[PDB]
C-alpha cells in the first residue's frame, strides 16, 4: 500500500476532525496530492487538492471550511475538516492528483460520519 | 546489433512522414540525429508505370555508405 | 547477460513507441477541458498532468475497444507526462464531470528524463500550439532517454 488514511469516526454536526494520510513507496514530495470522497448514494467525487509547490484547490461546497495541507518531512497529507455538516458524511479517500479534479492510485479510505 | 535496425527504421519513418507533408517530390538528402547517433538519409523519386507517384526513403549509418534500410512509399 | 538487458531495453522502447502511435495517429478532432483554473484541442504546457517537466493532453478516437462496443469509434481523453524519470501515459475513460474521475496512469518507458513536443503548422516546426480551432499538420514527439539520449517520432494528423 502507498496511501493509508487515519482519523475517521463520528462527530456531532458542527464539530471538527483531522484526517491524515500515511504516504509510502514513492517520492511523495514531488507529487501533487488530493482528497476524494464517496457520500452514500453518490459516486466518487473530488474534494480538494494540493500541488507539489504548496498551492491548494477546493470544491465550492467545502471551500473556506476544509483545509488541505502536507508534511514533506514525514510524508503525510492532512485534511482539517471544520464546521462538519451531515452532507459531508462519506468515505474519504486519499489519492494522487493529476490537476483539475482528477485523481489516481486511490487509497483504501476512512469513514467519516455525522447527522 | 539490432539497435541499428530499429533506429534506422525510425529515421526512415520520420522522413517518409516529412515528404508526405508535401507534390514537387524532388530527390533530396540529409541527416537526422537519433539515439545519440547521426543517420544519413536519402529520398529518391521512383517513376511508376501509371499516372495519378512513388519514392524510396533509404537510411545509412555512415556518410557515403550503403543503406541499412530502404522503404518504398506510394502517394497521389 | 548485459546483452539480454539491452535487448529487453529495445523491446521496452517499442512497447512505448507503439502505445504513442496508437494515440498520436488517432487524434480526435474534439476540444477537451482542463478542469482546474480552459479549453483546447491540444494541451501543452509545463507541469501539465503534474509532470516533472512538460505535459501533453488531447482527445483520442478509439475503434477497437475490448470492453465497450460502438462501431463508429469512442472518443476519450489521453495524455503523456514524465514522473520519477518515467514516461507515463494518462488515460481518462469517462466524460468530464464536476465530480471528477479516476485517471489511469500507466508507466510506459523507464529512464526517461525529458518529454518534448514540436508542432508542424504546414511550413515550419513551432514550440507551442495556440490554435484551438484546427490541429497541426504534423506532431514530433521527442523523448530524452538517459541511455540513448534524444529519440524523436513524427506523426501526421488527419484533417477536419
Ligand atoms: Cl483502438
Short mmCIF file of C-alpha atoms and ligand atoms in Angstrom, two decimals:
data_model
loop_
_atom_site.label_atom_id
_atom_site.label_comp_id
_atom_site.label_asym_id
_atom_site.label_seq_id
_atom_site.Cartn_x
_atom_site.Cartn_y
_atom_site.Cartn_z
CA UNK A 1 0.00 0.00 0.00
CA UNK A 2 1.13 3.53 -0.83
CA UNK A 3 -1.57 5.63 0.87
CA UNK A 4 -3.17 4.73 4.22
CA UNK A 5 -5.70 7.06 5.89
CA UNK A 6 -6.32 7.64 9.62
CA UNK A 7 -8.53 9.72 11.92
CA UNK A 8 -12.11 8.91 10.93
CA UNK A 9 -15.13 8.30 13.18
CA UNK A 10 -18.31 10.00 14.39
CA UNK A 11 -18.57 13.69 15.32
CA UNK A 12 -21.52 15.90 16.28
CA UNK A 13 -22.75 18.23 13.49
CA UNK A 14 -20.65 21.41 13.58
CA UNK A 15 -17.70 19.50 15.08
CA UNK A 16 -14.16 19.37 13.71
CA UNK A 17 -11.98 16.47 12.54
CA UNK A 18 -8.49 15.99 11.09
CA UNK A 19 -7.97 13.23 8.51
CA UNK A 20 -4.41 12.01 7.97
CA UNK A 21 -2.78 10.05 5.09
CA UNK A 22 0.39 7.97 5.55
CA UNK A 23 2.35 8.11 2.28
CA UNK A 24 4.95 5.46 1.39
CA UNK A 25 6.69 3.71 -1.52
CA UNK A 26 7.10 6.80 -3.76
CA UNK A 27 8.64 10.30 -3.94
CA UNK A 28 5.78 11.98 -2.03
CA UNK A 29 7.26 15.49 -2.01
CA UNK A 30 7.34 15.70 -5.83
CA UNK A 31 3.70 14.62 -6.30
CA UNK A 32 0.50 16.63 -6.36
CA UNK A 33 -1.91 15.04 -3.89
CA UNK A 34 -5.68 15.18 -3.34
CA UNK A 35 -8.61 14.13 -1.17
CA UNK A 36 -11.63 12.35 -2.67
CA UNK A 37 -14.90 11.28 -1.02
CA UNK A 38 -17.87 8.98 -1.67
CA UNK A 39 -21.08 10.01 0.07
CA UNK A 40 -23.82 7.35 0.35
CA UNK A 41 -25.95 7.18 -2.82
CA UNK A 42 -23.34 9.01 -4.92
CA UNK A 43 -20.24 8.13 -6.94
CA UNK A 44 -16.68 9.12 -6.08
CA UNK A 45 -16.26 12.92 -6.04
CA UNK A 46 -13.16 15.14 -5.85
CA UNK A 47 -12.97 17.20 -2.65
CA UNK A 48 -9.64 19.03 -2.50
CA UNK A 49 -6.10 19.02 -3.91
CA UNK A 50 -2.62 20.29 -3.07
CA UNK A 51 0.19 20.92 -5.56
CA UNK A 52 3.88 20.00 -5.12
CA UNK A 53 4.74 23.68 -4.54
CA UNK A 54 2.01 24.12 -1.89
CA UNK A 55 -0.82 25.71 -3.90
CA UNK A 56 -4.28 24.38 -2.97
CA UNK A 57 -7.70 23.95 -4.58
CA UNK A 58 -11.18 23.22 -3.17
CA UNK A 59 -14.69 22.36 -4.36
CA UNK A 60 -17.31 25.06 -3.78
CA UNK A 61 -19.36 23.09 -1.20
CA UNK A 62 -16.26 22.73 1.06
CA UNK A 63 -14.17 25.87 0.33
CA UNK A 64 -13.22 28.06 3.30
CA UNK A 65 -14.26 25.21 5.61
CA UNK A 66 -11.97 22.30 4.76
CA UNK A 67 -8.19 22.87 4.64
CA UNK A 68 -5.68 20.65 2.83
CA UNK A 69 -2.03 20.57 3.92
CA UNK A 70 1.08 18.40 3.67
CA UNK A 71 4.16 17.43 5.73
CA UNK A 72 7.04 16.54 3.40
CA UNK A 73 9.28 15.52 6.33
CA UNK A 74 7.07 12.62 7.48
CA UNK A 75 5.31 12.15 4.09
CA UNK A 76 1.82 12.83 5.46
CA UNK A 77 -1.15 14.55 3.80
CA UNK A 78 -3.73 16.20 6.08
CA UNK A 79 -7.32 17.39 5.73
CA UNK A 80 -8.52 19.71 8.51
CA UNK A 81 -12.32 19.48 8.41
CA UNK A 82 -14.22 22.22 10.28
CA UNK A 83 -17.93 23.02 10.70
CA UNK A 84 -18.79 19.47 9.61
CA UNK A 85 -22.29 19.18 8.11
CA UNK A 86 -24.39 15.98 7.72
CA UNK A 87 -23.92 16.23 3.92
CA UNK A 88 -20.17 15.62 4.44
CA UNK A 89 -20.85 12.10 5.72
CA UNK A 90 -18.85 9.97 3.28
CA UNK A 91 -15.95 7.56 2.82
CA UNK A 92 -12.92 9.87 2.48
CA UNK A 93 -10.12 8.60 0.24
CA UNK A 94 -6.57 9.89 -0.14
CA UNK A 95 -5.17 9.92 -3.70
CA UNK A 96 -2.51 11.25 -6.06
CA UNK A 97 -3.62 14.28 -8.06
CA UNK A 98 -3.49 14.95 -11.83
CA UNK A 99 -4.59 18.58 -11.57
CA UNK A 100 -8.16 19.64 -12.29
CA UNK A 101 -10.46 17.34 -10.31
CA UNK A 102 -8.98 14.03 -11.46
CA UNK A 103 -7.14 11.52 -9.25
CA UNK A 104 -5.34 8.15 -9.35
CA UNK A 105 -3.80 5.49 -7.05
CA UNK A 106 -6.66 5.93 -4.60
CA UNK A 107 -6.19 4.71 -1.02
CA UNK A 108 -8.43 2.34 0.95
CA UNK A 109 -10.18 5.18 2.82
CA UNK A 110 -11.66 6.08 6.21
CA UNK A 111 -15.30 6.51 7.24
CA UNK A 112 -16.36 9.97 8.41
CA UNK A 113 -19.96 10.19 9.69
CA UNK A 114 -22.31 12.89 11.03
CA UNK A 115 -26.07 13.65 11.15
CA UNK B 1 23.25 -5.29 -33.24
CA UNK B 2 19.51 -4.75 -33.83
CA UNK B 3 19.77 -1.28 -32.26
CA UNK B 4 20.92 -0.12 -35.71
CA UNK B 5 18.00 -1.89 -37.42
CA UNK B 6 15.40 -0.29 -35.13
CA UNK B 7 16.86 3.24 -35.11
CA UNK B 8 17.38 3.29 -38.89
CA UNK B 9 13.72 2.28 -39.33
CA UNK B 10 12.64 5.11 -37.01
CA UNK B 11 14.58 7.67 -39.07
CA UNK B 12 13.09 6.22 -42.28
CA UNK B 13 9.55 6.60 -40.84
CA UNK B 14 10.21 10.20 -39.82
CA UNK B 15 11.45 11.20 -43.29
CA UNK B 16 8.64 9.29 -45.03
CA UNK B 17 6.24 11.43 -42.99
CA UNK B 18 8.09 14.64 -43.90
CA UNK B 19 7.86 14.00 -47.66
CA UNK B 20 4.14 13.24 -47.15
CA UNK B 21 3.69 16.79 -45.79
CA UNK B 22 4.06 17.95 -49.41
CA UNK B 23 3.77 17.37 -54.78
CA UNK B 24 7.07 18.51 -56.31
CA UNK B 25 8.76 15.49 -54.71
CA UNK B 26 12.39 16.07 -55.71
CA UNK B 27 15.30 13.77 -54.86
CA UNK B 28 16.53 15.21 -51.56
CA UNK B 29 19.01 14.03 -48.93
CA UNK B 30 20.02 14.94 -45.38
CA UNK B 31 20.90 13.96 -41.82
CA UNK B 32 18.96 13.14 -38.64
CA UNK B 33 20.28 12.92 -35.09
CA UNK B 34 18.62 9.98 -33.28
CA UNK B 35 19.55 7.66 -30.39
CA UNK B 36 22.79 9.63 -29.90
CA UNK B 37 23.96 8.87 -33.46
CA UNK B 38 23.99 10.53 -36.88
CA UNK B 39 21.84 8.96 -39.61
CA UNK B 40 22.25 9.82 -43.30
CA UNK B 41 19.01 9.59 -45.31
CA UNK B 42 18.01 9.96 -48.97
CA UNK B 43 14.56 10.33 -50.52
CA UNK B 44 14.56 9.32 -54.20
CA UNK B 45 11.53 9.55 -56.54
CA UNK B 46 10.62 6.35 -58.30
CA UNK B 47 8.80 6.66 -61.63
CA UNK B 48 5.74 4.40 -61.86
CA UNK B 49 4.12 2.51 -64.74
CA UNK B 50 0.98 4.68 -64.49
CA UNK B 51 -0.31 8.23 -63.82
CA UNK B 52 -2.02 9.72 -60.73
CA UNK B 53 3.75 8.68 -57.87
CA UNK B 54 6.36 6.85 -55.74
CA UNK B 55 9.56 7.35 -53.74
CA UNK B 56 12.28 5.44 -51.86
CA UNK B 57 13.43 6.51 -48.40
CA UNK B 58 16.82 4.97 -47.53
CA UNK B 59 18.93 5.48 -44.38
CA UNK B 60 22.62 4.73 -43.77
CA UNK B 61 24.85 4.60 -40.66
CA UNK B 62 27.81 6.27 -42.44
CA UNK B 63 28.24 9.21 -44.83
CA UNK B 64 28.83 7.61 -48.27
CA UNK B 65 27.97 4.04 -47.18
CA UNK B 66 25.28 1.60 -48.37
CA UNK B 67 21.86 1.94 -46.68
CA UNK B 68 20.86 -0.48 -43.91
CA UNK B 69 17.16 0.03 -44.74
CA UNK B 70 15.26 1.13 -47.87
CA UNK B 71 11.46 1.57 -47.89
CA UNK B 72 9.18 2.35 -50.86
CA UNK B 73 6.10 4.55 -50.40
CA UNK B 74 3.21 5.40 -52.74
CA UNK B 75 1.32 8.71 -52.86
CA UNK B 76 -1.17 10.67 -55.05
CA UNK C 1 23.83 -11.18 -19.76
CA UNK C 2 24.02 -7.41 -20.13
CA UNK C 3 23.07 -8.13 -23.74
CA UNK C 4 19.74 -9.64 -22.60
CA UNK C 5 19.13 -6.41 -20.68
CA UNK C 6 19.85 -4.26 -23.77
CA UNK C 7 17.69 -6.47 -25.99
CA UNK C 8 14.90 -6.03 -23.44
CA UNK C 9 15.51 -2.27 -23.40
CA UNK C 10 14.83 -2.06 -27.14
CA UNK C 11 11.62 -4.09 -26.63
CA UNK C 12 10.60 -1.67 -23.87
CA UNK C 13 11.16 1.28 -26.23
CA UNK C 14 8.99 -0.39 -28.90
CA UNK C 15 6.15 -1.01 -26.43
CA UNK C 16 6.30 2.71 -25.58
CA UNK C 17 6.51 3.86 -29.21
CA UNK C 18 3.61 1.63 -30.36
CA UNK C 19 1.47 2.97 -27.49
CA UNK C 20 2.32 6.51 -28.62
CA UNK C 21 1.47 5.54 -32.22
CA UNK C 22 -1.99 4.38 -31.14
CA UNK C 23 -2.69 7.80 -29.55
CA UNK C 24 -0.92 10.35 -31.78
CA UNK C 25 -2.11 8.74 -35.03
CA UNK C 26 -5.70 8.61 -33.75
CA UNK C 27 -6.04 12.20 -32.50
CA UNK C 28 -9.73 13.11 -32.38
CA UNK C 29 -10.99 16.49 -33.61
CA UNK C 30 -12.65 17.33 -30.28
CA UNK C 31 -11.84 20.04 -27.74
CA UNK C 32 -11.07 18.81 -24.22
CA UNK C 33 -11.19 20.81 -20.99
CA UNK C 34 -8.60 21.21 -18.22
CA UNK C 35 -10.91 21.50 -15.19
CA UNK C 36 -8.58 23.45 -12.84
CA UNK C 37 -8.34 27.24 -13.08
CA UNK C 38 -9.55 26.35 -20.12
CA UNK C 39 -10.49 24.51 -23.35
CA UNK C 40 -8.25 23.41 -26.26
CA UNK C 41 -7.69 20.76 -28.96
CA UNK C 42 -4.08 20.10 -27.94
CA UNK C 43 -2.97 20.93 -24.38
CA UNK C 44 0.77 21.51 -23.97
CA UNK C 45 2.50 23.20 -21.03
CA UNK C 46 4.95 22.82 -18.15
CA UNK C 47 3.80 20.68 -15.20
CA UNK C 48 0.60 19.62 -17.01
CA UNK C 49 -0.84 16.43 -15.50
CA UNK C 50 1.63 17.00 -12.63
CA UNK C 51 4.57 16.25 -14.95
CA UNK C 52 8.10 16.77 -13.62
CA UNK C 53 8.70 18.78 -16.81
CA UNK C 54 6.47 19.02 -19.92
CA UNK C 55 2.97 17.51 -20.11
CA UNK C 56 0.65 16.87 -23.07
CA UNK C 57 -3.09 16.10 -23.22
CA UNK C 58 -5.53 15.61 -26.13
CA UNK C 59 -8.65 13.81 -27.37
CA UNK C 60 -8.32 10.33 -28.90
CA UNK C 61 -10.58 8.27 -31.19
CA UNK C 62 -10.70 4.54 -30.33
CA UNK C 63 -12.28 1.90 -32.57
CA UNK C 64 -11.27 -1.49 -31.17
CA UNK C 65 -12.40 -1.03 -27.56
CA UNK C 66 -12.47 -4.54 -25.99
CA UNK C 67 -14.70 -3.55 -23.04
CA UNK C 68 -17.29 -1.37 -24.84
CA UNK C 69 -18.75 -1.72 -28.37
CA UNK C 70 -19.55 1.34 -30.52
CA UNK C 71 -18.71 0.75 -34.20
CA UNK C 72 -18.19 4.45 -35.02
CA UNK C 73 -15.33 4.84 -32.50
CA UNK C 74 -15.34 6.05 -28.89
CA UNK C 75 -13.82 9.45 -28.14
CA UNK C 76 -11.72 9.57 -24.97
CA UNK C 77 -9.18 11.94 -23.46
CA UNK C 78 -5.50 10.89 -23.28
CA UNK C 79 -2.20 12.38 -22.14
CA UNK C 80 1.52 11.93 -21.55
CA UNK C 81 3.96 13.08 -18.87
CA UNK C 82 7.22 12.37 -17.06
CA UNK C 83 7.19 11.32 -13.40
CA UNK C 84 10.19 9.99 -11.46
CA UNK C 85 12.11 9.76 -14.76
CA UNK C 86 9.46 7.51 -16.35
CA UNK C 87 7.36 8.28 -19.42
CA UNK C 88 3.78 7.73 -18.25
CA UNK C 89 0.54 7.56 -20.23
CA UNK C 90 -2.54 9.06 -18.58
CA UNK C 91 -5.98 7.89 -19.73
CA UNK C 92 -9.46 9.20 -18.94
CA UNK C 93 -12.11 6.52 -19.58
CA UNK C 94 -15.29 8.52 -18.90
CA UNK C 95 -16.52 12.06 -19.78
CA UNK C 96 -15.63 15.23 -17.80
CA UNK C 97 -17.83 15.91 -14.74
CA UNK C 98 -17.54 18.40 -11.84
CA UNK C 99 -17.30 15.25 -9.67
CA UNK C 100 -14.01 14.26 -11.33
CA UNK C 101 -12.79 10.78 -12.26
CA UNK C 102 -10.11 8.19 -11.54
CA UNK C 103 -7.37 8.64 -14.14
CA UNK C 104 -5.43 5.58 -15.33
CA UNK C 105 -1.70 6.29 -15.05
CA UNK C 106 0.44 3.70 -16.82
CA UNK C 107 4.26 3.88 -16.94
CA UNK C 108 5.45 3.07 -20.49
CA UNK C 109 9.20 3.71 -20.51
CA UNK C 110 11.78 3.84 -17.71
CA UNK C 111 14.86 6.09 -17.51
CA UNK C 112 13.25 8.93 -19.50
CA UNK C 113 14.44 12.39 -18.40
CA UNK C 114 12.55 14.78 -20.67
CA UNK C 115 9.42 14.94 -22.81
CA UNK C 116 9.33 17.45 -25.66
CA UNK C 117 6.83 18.02 -28.48
CA UNK C 118 7.05 20.20 -31.58
CA UNK C 119 4.16 21.06 -33.93
CA UNK C 120 4.27 21.45 -37.73
CA UNK C 121 1.76 24.09 -38.90
CA UNK C 122 2.21 23.33 -42.60
CA UNK C 123 5.57 25.00 -43.35
CA UNK C 124 7.59 25.17 -40.09
CA UNK C 125 8.09 23.39 -36.73
CA UNK C 126 6.99 25.53 -33.75
CA UNK C 127 7.27 25.16 -29.96
CA UNK C 128 3.64 25.82 -28.93
CA UNK C 129 0.14 25.34 -30.37
CA UNK C 130 -2.27 28.19 -29.59
CA UNK C 131 -4.74 27.33 -32.39
CA UNK C 132 -7.77 25.74 -30.70
CA UNK C 133 -9.83 25.51 -33.93
CA UNK C 134 -7.64 23.19 -36.06
CA UNK C 135 -4.89 20.59 -35.47
CA UNK C 136 -1.28 20.92 -36.64
CA UNK C 137 -0.34 19.12 -39.87
CA UNK C 138 2.31 17.07 -38.04
CA UNK C 139 3.46 16.38 -34.46
CA UNK C 140 7.02 15.41 -33.45
CA UNK C 141 7.27 13.71 -30.04
CA UNK C 142 10.86 13.78 -28.71
CA UNK C 143 11.89 11.59 -25.76
CA UNK C 144 15.23 12.17 -23.99
CA UNK C 145 16.38 8.78 -22.63
CA UNK C 146 19.16 8.50 -20.04
CA UNK C 147 20.99 5.79 -22.03
CA UNK C 148 20.20 6.54 -25.70
CA UNK C 149 19.59 10.31 -25.47
CA UNK C 150 17.16 12.05 -27.83
CA UNK C 151 14.80 9.92 -29.91
CA UNK C 152 12.04 11.56 -31.96
CA UNK C 153 8.94 10.25 -33.73
CA UNK C 154 6.82 12.17 -36.27
CA UNK C 155 3.04 11.76 -36.57
CA UNK C 156 0.76 13.03 -39.35
CA UNK C 157 -2.64 14.22 -38.13
CA UNK C 158 -5.89 13.51 -40.02
CA UNK C 159 -7.56 16.76 -41.11
CA UNK C 160 -11.08 18.02 -40.33
CL1 LIG D 1 -8.09 1.47 -30.83
#
